[PDB]
Point group: C4
Chain length 455, copies 4
């Protein structure tokens, strides 16, 4: 039994020396790295085509329908007078009606299809306002029934000029319409073009009632297969990836079963879950997981190519994660040699103490996150949301973007002095505590763990 247990833990070269076993798993891992990376790149081609089509069409729509729009002005684009708002709305509708004659793209109109469009209508121009809206700031009085009423005009593609906005109680104005187009660029990749429907929403937002009405344009893209198109090997490569991953999965499962049987035999011999897991090859669990991910991604990719699916983002995430895991999994074979296994050995020795340290660090980090989000968020562009606050604080710990973070608050030193002083204390204390004390101890734990396994 001792001989078999010793053999179970021998390196591939040692196993070959002992029993002459050939290292098929290693060759399979190398082949998998190659083929999976190539497959990821080949998929990225079509993924890029789709993403580019969507974004370029959206930019073209912004230039066509938003009056006076220029690149880079999305965050500040707004109207400030009644005349500006009327001109913007009428320009959008007029451009919609003039699209066939002026546009560089070829678009088809969509009619009906439920709310907000009536039958035969292509464009819906709807204004939303309070049901009762008497507002008298001169007398410091108001009488509001805040139930929202929607009044919407229908425009058929080739009376909206009579639009009368209820400015004092206006909640917002929206323009909805759909356009159909064809993604011809797919031909460059030897693929059949798809049929895109863009749902375009233009919003003039007055929910702040502040005298400034921001204007935005958004799109939703729906991809469908076209009807009987005419155009005057990746599938084999996908099948090859499938076969390679299936064989790797089978071999890893066989190894895991053998390890489980050996574990049972050893436990019986001794007549301790931590000692039990010494027979579990975590690398092979990772390999099996990566193989499942790769096969799922390949099936999804084939379905997308066959026009049965259009979930490009899910496929890309699956294939990219599988590629990263496939590259990582080859480190299993450097673990047998000490001089090539410093990183994994240090990880193994250091992880527990690092987690125990993080237990204490996390409460402080979260307290700072919440405090900054709520107190500074209204004044600081980097504290608008909780995820943004976490990104800002994490970057600060790494010494990144410090001065601009300080400078964003310099504008408040005259307006809100107390908030400025609080921001000074907040930023200085956080930076000092986390850079010079928390991170120092984190690195000290890691390097001490390294010192433990050095020899």
């Amino acid at each position: 039994l001792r001989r078999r247990l010793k053999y179970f833990f021998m390196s591939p070269c040692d196993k070959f020396r002992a029993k002459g076993r050939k290292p098929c798993k290693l060759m399979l891992q190398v082949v998998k790295i190659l083929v999976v990376t190539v497959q990821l790149i080949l998929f990225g081609l079509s993924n890029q085509l789709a993403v580019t089509f969507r974004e370029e069409n959206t930019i073209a729509f912004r230039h066509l329908f938003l009056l006076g729009y220029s690149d880079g002005a999305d965050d500040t684009f707004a109207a400030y007078t009644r005349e500006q708002l009327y001109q913007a709305i009428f320009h959008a509708v007029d451009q919609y009606l003039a699209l066939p004659d002026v546009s560089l793209g070829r678009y088809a109109y969509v009619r009906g299809g439920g709310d907000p469009w009536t039958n035969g209508s292509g464009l819906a121009l709807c204004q939303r306002y309070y049901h009762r809206g008497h507002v008298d700031p001169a007398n410091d009085t108001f009488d509001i029934d805040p139930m929202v009423v929607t009044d919407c005009i229908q425009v058929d593609p080739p009376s909206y000029k009579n639009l009368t906005l209820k400015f004092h109680k206006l909640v917002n104005v929206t323009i909805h319409f759909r356009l159909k187009t064809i993604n011809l660029q797919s031909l460059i990749n030897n693929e059949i073009p798809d049929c895109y429907t863009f749902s375009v929403l233009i919003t003039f937002d007055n929910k702040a009632h502040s005298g400034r009405i921001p204007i935005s344009l958004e799109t939703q893209a729906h991809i469908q297969e076209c009807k009987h198109p005419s155009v005057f090997f990746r599938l084999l490569f996908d099948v090859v990836v499938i076969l390679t991953c299936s064989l790797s999965f089978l071999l890893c499962a066989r190894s895991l079963l053998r390890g489980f049987l050996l574990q049972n035999e050893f436990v019986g011999f001794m007549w301790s879950l931590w000692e039990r897991l010494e027979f579990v090859n975590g690398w092979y669990i990772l390999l099996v997981t990566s193989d499942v991910l790769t096969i799922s991604g390949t099936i999804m990719k084939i379905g997308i190519e066959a026009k049965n699916l259009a979930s490009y983002d899910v496929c890309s995430i699956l294939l990219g994660t599988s590629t990263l895991l496939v590259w990582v999994g080859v480190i299993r074979y450097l673990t047998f040699f000490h001089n090539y296994n410093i990183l994994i050995a240090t990880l193994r020795v250091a992880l527990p103490s690092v987690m125990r340290f993080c237990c204490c660090v996390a409460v402080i980090y979260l307290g700072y996150c919440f405090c900054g989000w709520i107190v500074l968020g209204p004044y600081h562009v980097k504290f608008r949301s909780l995820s943004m606050v976490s990104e800002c604080l994490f970057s600060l710990i790494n010494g990144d973007d410090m001065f601009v973070t300080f400078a964003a608050m310099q504008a408040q030193q005259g307006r809100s002095s107390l908030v400025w002083l609080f921001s000074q204390l907040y930023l200085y204390s956080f930076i000092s505590l986390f850079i010079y004390m928390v991170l120092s101890l984190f690195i000290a734990l890691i390097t001490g763990a390294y010192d433990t396994i050095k020899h």
Copy 2:
């Protein structure tokens, strides 16, 4: 006595094992974290509403009243010819008079109310100039009585076109007026809208007499309750926070009193203030402070909701600081376990030596701050004020924004060669000394303290 002293320092689990004592303080701390964080977020809703109203109205005013204004031009917006200045002033007054017909917001005029407005006047257009201003650069002569004289025209809301500026002795021009509006967006938060009065000041500043007159717009917002408004549970949550913090305060005070009595008993037994403080639970002092802060913030928040107060910034600071302290205070219960107490133990061992080191470092840092502020401030945008200089130097020590700091002075290499050379020496010496020597020793002190408590 020895048994009681030993019990006083036992961990909550150990105390429960000994006497069966239930850990009510721990559950209270967890509940407090939850409820205080939720309360902070709920307050942040209305705080954001108020801040957004103020800033959005100010931006709308800049777009309405400043001729040719565009976003991002605040720091350079200026006039350069007499015609430009006259056009800007007349545009501001004309827009003020046209506001009801053009603006997207609904504003009411304010009349009278003391200086600078006379009775019945809504807008004050005042120019300030030297009492005697004979200036003759051709003969290199001047005769100045620099007492400032203010001549101000009054405009009633729906003769200012006869304004004649004394350019050669003009100190500045100002336009003052007030507008009333209602913050309707509060309805979205189930709150009654408040009545805002904006005091708008437009400044055309000629104090430099340099041929360039910068133009700025500032606002002051005063919030008041409206008279008999009509609109067709947070209070219980605030009460819950109050009760939780009061109970925590009572328990912490009881523990502190018990510790004080035990301290007195021990001192009597021995028949040393540093040894005396071993009976003071600093965590409980922090908890009591945080409870006082939370109760004060909650009372202020309730008063604001009842329309008795409008100090949003003070309330936000109180509640955010209390939230951070509440999150921090839970570390008291990790202090009993060595593997979870690395940070606090290292802090305790390291703080004195770090303070002694800072004693020496501070004089050098302040010398650099003053030197840079006065010598480079006129030439470097990052050295304009003392707080700005401190932020810049602190960011440099952390390696942030170094190259742009160097590059701002590259424009002086042709104009002011000596100042450029001095800036080179200043920056290089500061960066080298503080990054490679001061900070190295700081981190060395902290990690040596860690090494002392490692085992």
Copy 3:
């Protein structure tokens, strides 16, 4: 023999003390540093002249031929309506025909010379479109023969107004023409001006068929000697550099041969390639390589000055690399003194373990590179290409540009939520793993190697 072997490894001062040998190699190295650096600067003069001529002419062309172009708009310059595209094309052609009357430069036309120009034609205006292009998004149909057909109009320098674009199947439009000019600024450097031919290509790109057609201008510069020009010592310096490098090469070769003979004698005496290489002076191999590079660069520079060559970039790379190597090569003489040889000794002790560590780190780095390139590239401006991804990740490891990397993805939190979440996981995991664990161990290896050679 032992005496001779000991002498072979003595320092220059020790060798002078023993045999009175003069250190000609050291003086040669100092002289080489001086002369090679001076030569590099003198070459940089003319290299700068050439590069500046090319870039300034290209900018002038962009301002002359692109309608409505402004500096900084290269990456967004595009047309969005048919009228805009026609106006841009006609403006380019009209400016080409008006060049002699409006331009600040003096340009000559080029006619004929093969495709795309016919005999006598100076400008080629060609549109490329699908051979069969029936596109019917209304019926979700298309019939495409995607073979590209080029129809191109010829314009002679002083019918193109009848251009009719086939928008629905348009692949792109191009304008090709060549201009001749003379680089007069060379006179300031006491050099004969060269004759430049600029090949200008203007592209209106519709390969995306997205309704947005980007517009770009590119140039290729060909330098030729002019015919019998009239204009009413660097060569000696180049010869001096040649002689210095040749003498250094001869001395280094002599030393290497002597070392080889001593190695053979020692091997014979002992009656081990690693022990063999102890007789190889790597510094002298570096010196010989640098001398070859310097002589090659000097010959290329002389050829360029004589107008036989125009490969400025190759010459600059050769001379700059040789200058860096010449500066580095003087460290050979600090190796004899321990207190001046810390860097090289640590390098020698540390390189093997660092390479073994990199073996493991590289697979993880490459997995991350591929995953990020394919998954985030379509959404993140910093992940567009593989080299860009490597630059971004390498900068992140050094803590640079972290927050903007996070912020570029905040625009996707609303559009593509899943891709945003994946980017969060990707960035956080990469930064943590590589900054706090991989780099820590890298630095630990280097400083441990230093500790080994410290005394």
Copy 4:
């Protein structure tokens, strides 16, 4: 003698305990810190006034005289057609002639005064071109006599419209004129306004002959006292600073002389320059130097206030350096206590080895500097000059601005592939070598020196 030698090295408290000596030097140092800092701030007031006047006038001139100028366009402002250049030149001259009627500042004209102005002339409009300029790119020929000829038109303040530019051989065009103004803002600081003469030079530069002519405006300011001005305590503070610094200088000189006498006595007793310098108080040499600097700066400041001098920059440098040295000099009294003297002790132990390390590092750094400056300078905005290259590399070593440095070269990956590849190798090798190996050893030396003096 041993008692006296022991006393000479006792701390101020120890000296007071022994002989009752009062610590006048310490109180003097504190008083000096206070008064010198206050004096620096008070001077900074007037220094800021002068600098602001100059810069604001220059900006106003750019807006007045440069046609179509806008803020932030200095680096790209240029003409591209003959019509643009003529319009710019005529606009500048017309604005000069219209200044009294349009400008917001009050300016006086200056006439005559030597070249380039003739007697009675206020504006000089001069074009410079080659003496013989036959240029024929069509025939690839030219005949150049490159001697520069200047033809200059004189305009008297209230024929230049007949300007005919020789475009094909034009070297440049310049406009020179002078304006007198008075810095009235000084009144706010209770100072008599000075009389400024601005020498304005507008350059239209065609030295590249590239079809793009950049346009720039520069000013030189000369300050003179005005003649018999009329306007309807800092001097005592300066005198106080003088007295304090003189007394400190006297005491430091007395201490240095006493130390010298004790050194002579000890040397005589022993019957070694390094041992000799143990009697030299370097802190007192620093104090004497700082006192000399402060007195010189104070005298210069008084002279400036009396209108005898106008060298604001020299005075500011003197006073700022003296302030920094005065703040630093107080560390002399923390050297007696070990826990407060870590920084200086580590400096003393570490400086020699650090210098020996820098001996080797400097040659590599300089090689990289020269290589980058000459090879990448024409392509990279951060490598234009040698000082800029040093700043860029120094910032890179500190991990600052890495990604933008990489990204500036991404534009060359298509144009100049070889230069892009070289830049990749250059940047990667420099960053790796200097961040991970050179800086690691630098910090290791410093922390090892700290370890030597730790106990």
